[PDB]
Amino acid sequence: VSRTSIYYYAGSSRLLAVGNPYFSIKSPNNNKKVLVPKVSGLQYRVFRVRLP
């Protein structure tokens, strides 16, 4: 692999993430209908970023 002399920037502007800190709740109607998602301060935040 040969290094060239070109560089670039990537912009990934602010993310929204709110919900219940304890568990997740779902609908009484179905069982796959999420209502507010479980998000805590202990969750494994893993990102999957594409590249052009």
Partner: protein, 52 residues
Amino acid sequence: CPPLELFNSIIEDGDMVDTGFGCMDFGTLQANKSDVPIDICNSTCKYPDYLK
């Protein structure tokens, strides 16, 4: 449960920093007026937004 929204404004003096209880407006989002000390209960606390 009321939905949460990200507001942003200008800091003026007399207003307080966060005290570990969430950067939010305690006056309109609480009703009991009995969850925080009396210093911040009728006001809102702010915090910087360094990346913005």
